[PDB]
Design a protein around this ligand. Structure first.
Ligand SMILES: CCC(=O)N1CCN(c2ncnc3cc(-c4c(C)ccc5[nH]ncc45)c(Cl)cc23)CC1
Ligand SMILES: Nc1nc2c(ncn2[C@@H]2O[C@H](COP(=O)(O)OP(=O)(O)O)[C@@H](O)[C@H]2O)c(=O)[nH]1
Ligand SMILES: [Mg+2]
Length: 169
């Protein structure tokens, strides 16, 4: 019934594709084409409501595009994905939030901070500083792992609930 247009952003290799494939198809991919930038549909039930999730898995190159601007303009919620073992990807989160705020012309955009690869032991980004950033953005923070599926459902579902609150707001 209700359609939700989600967009997954984040640096290369943080697990954007792997997180999306786990949600849609329930399996962890060891490798996925890092150039494929396409959207995926899936019908789910969230808080007792049939929701049609339309999830754009961003990839491609590091270039600006008026077409990519339309992607964020069409999107209703955004997953800010970084890898807990890649400090560079965590620093990139600011850039991705800035580019989304640039398009939608608003600081009130449904977003969720996603710390991926929580199964890995080589942690370089503290949970506290990830919570501190999400607090500063005023958005939820969820630690996920596309390998064990831990936190994957909670990541996308929280974004859907953020969109619902934004609609009432
Ligand atoms: C495997 C390689 C990989 O996963 N990539 C994914 C991230 N890509 C990006 N890198 C740097 N900045 C990027 C900026 C944008 C962007 C955003 C977030 C919002 C509006 C926009 N309008 N035009 C571009 C844009 C996007 Cl969609 C991707 C970026 C590199 C390849
Ligand atoms: N251990 C672990 N590895 C992951 C996880 N998510 C993704 N990966 C690995 O990270 C690599 C790149 O993931 P990918 O989905 O292509 O990231 P993307 O470029 O942002 O789309 C892949 O080889 C995956 O096996 C995770 O939650 N845990
Ligand atoms: Mg990918």
């Amino acid at each position: 019934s209700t359609e939700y247009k989600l967009v997954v952003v984040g640096a290369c290799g943080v697990g954007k594709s792997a997180l999306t494939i786990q949600l849609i198809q329930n399996h962890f991919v060891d490798e996925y084409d890092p150039t494929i930038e396409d959207s995926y549909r899936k019908q789910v039930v969230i808080d007792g409501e049939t929701s049609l999730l339309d999830i754009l898995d961003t990839a491609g190159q590091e270039e600006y595009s008026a077409m990519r601007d339309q992607y964020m303009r069409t999107g209703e919620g955004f997953l800010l994905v970084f890898a807990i073992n890649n400090t560079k990807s965590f620093e990139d989160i600011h850039h991705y939030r800035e580019q989304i705020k640039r398009v939608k012309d608003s600081e009130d955009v449904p977003m969720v901070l996603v710390g991926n690869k929580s199964d890995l032991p080589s942690r370089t980004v503290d949970t506290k500083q990830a919570q501190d950033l999400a607090r500063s953005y005023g958005i939820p923070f969820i630690e996920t792992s596309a390998k064990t599926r831990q936190g994957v459902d909670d990541a996308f579902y929280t974004l859907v609930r953020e969109i619902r609150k934004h609609k009432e707001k």
